[PDB]
Amino acid sequence: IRPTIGQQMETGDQRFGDLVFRQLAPNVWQHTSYLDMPGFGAVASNGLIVRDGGRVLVVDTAWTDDQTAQILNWIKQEINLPVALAVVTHAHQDKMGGMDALHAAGIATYANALSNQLAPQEGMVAAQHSLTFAANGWVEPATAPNFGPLKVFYPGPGHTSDNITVGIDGTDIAFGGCLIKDSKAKSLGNLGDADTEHYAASARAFGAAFPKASMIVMSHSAPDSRAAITHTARMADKLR
Ligand SMILES: CCOC(=O)[C@]1(CS)N[C@@H](C(=O)O)C(C)(C)S1
Ligand SMILES: [Zn+2]
Ligand SMILES: [Zn+2]
């Protein structure tokens, strides 16, 4: 695909059906799925796959159940370990559109409690479990059982009021989801669900929560350096 929004395909990318997978680190891969929007073309959305010992952890579904089932198929082929859990980073179609494929496979799913509360209104299937957060934004660990290397952080409202972010312990990788755009981005996208007053602070909070991450993975750009966080925050400063 040659998406209008999202990175092009590069050497080292693997095509598996209509999905693209890229290894980012020895136990981390980016999954990419595409949704065609009329007149506007293909929009890429990225999530993560993490191998944690004898199990696999997933961050975000694909746009659709069928695509998300193909993520599970790719995992079976390339990793061949059971998927223990998935965490989805807000209640939009690119992040939660494939929940049914996860639940059909018996995979435990997790989301911000607010994401689960909003899911019906957003046309999404709620996750099976709800994460809650301390006042400093870090997940309450009782609500993130056996998350292994996944360090979940709620940076505050930005892209949506429920957006969460995930650091991958033992790697240089932090996932900003749809909150962060890369340093070449010209806009933060549509902003219809956004908190334009708090966006900038939330972007900076994400950077401060994962201060040593050097590879920033995001939903709608290829991985970038930490400049993606600052550039996003500075674009968000102009919304106030
Ligand atoms: C089907 C709903 O999914 C969307 O429309 C997203 C989800 S974040 N929002 C858009 C935006 O923020 O402009 C986008 C093009 C980045 S994908
Ligand atoms: Zn979104
Ligand atoms: Zn998105």
UniProtKB/Swiss-Prot annotation:
<feature type="binding site">
    <location>
        <position position="90"/>
    </location>
    <ligand>
        <name>Zn(2+) 1</name>
    </ligand>
</feature>
<comment type="subunit">
    <text>Monomer.</text>
</comment>
<feature type="binding site">
    <location>
        <position position="92"/>
    </location>
    <ligand>
        <name>Zn(2+) 1</name>
    </ligand>
</feature>
<keyword id="KW-0732">Signal</keyword>
<comment type="function">
    <text>Confers resistance to the different beta-lactams antibiotics (penicillin, cephalosporin and carbapenem) via the hydrolysis of the beta-lactam ring. Does not confer resistance to the polymixin colistin or the fluoroquinolone ciprofloxacin.</text>
</comment>
<dbReference type="InterPro" id="IPR036866">
    <property type="entry name" value="RibonucZ/Hydroxyglut_hydro"/>
</dbReference>
<dbReference type="InterPro" id="IPR001279">
    <property type="entry name" value="Metallo-B-lactamas"/>
</dbReference>
<keyword id="KW-0046">Antibiotic resistance</keyword>
<dbReference type="GO" id="GO:0008270">
    <property type="term" value="F:zinc ion binding"/>
</dbReference>
<keyword id="KW-0614">Plasmid</keyword>
<comment type="similarity">
    <text>Belongs to the metallo-beta-lactamase superfamily. Class-B beta-lactamase family.</text>
</comment>
<dbReference type="InterPro" id="IPR050855">
    <property type="entry name" value="NDM-1-like"/>
</dbReference>
<dbReference type="GO" id="GO:0008800">
    <property type="term" value="F:beta-lactamase activity"/>
</dbReference>
<protein>
    <recommendedName>
        <fullName>Metallo-beta-lactamase type 2</fullName>
        <ecNumber>3.5.2.6</ecNumber>
    </recommendedName>
</protein>
<feature type="binding site">
    <location>
        <position position="94"/>
    </location>
    <ligand>
        <name>Zn(2+) 2</name>
    </ligand>
</feature>
<feature type="binding site">
    <location>
        <position position="220"/>
    </location>
    <ligand>
        <name>Zn(2+) 2</name>
    </ligand>
</feature>
<dbReference type="GO" id="GO:0046677">
    <property type="term" value="P:response to antibiotic"/>
</dbReference>
<feature type="binding site">
    <location>
        <position position="181"/>
    </location>
    <ligand>
        <name>substrate</name>
    </ligand>
</feature>
<feature type="binding site">
    <location>
        <position position="159"/>
    </location>
    <ligand>
        <name>Zn(2+) 1</name>
    </ligand>
</feature>
<keyword id="KW-0862">Zinc</keyword>
<dbReference type="GO" id="GO:0017001">
    <property type="term" value="P:antibiotic catabolic process"/>
</dbReference>
<keyword id="KW-0574">Periplasm</keyword>
<dbReference type="Pfam" id="PF00753">
    <property type="entry name" value="Lactamase_B"/>
</dbReference>
<keyword id="KW-0378">Hydrolase</keyword>
<dbReference type="GO" id="GO:0042597">
    <property type="term" value="C:periplasmic space"/>
</dbReference>
<keyword id="KW-0479">Metal-binding</keyword>
<feature type="binding site">
    <location>
        <position position="178"/>
    </location>
    <ligand>
        <name>Zn(2+) 2</name>
    </ligand>
</feature>
<feature type="binding site">
    <location>
        <position position="190"/>
    </location>
    <ligand>
        <name>substrate</name>
    </ligand>
</feature>
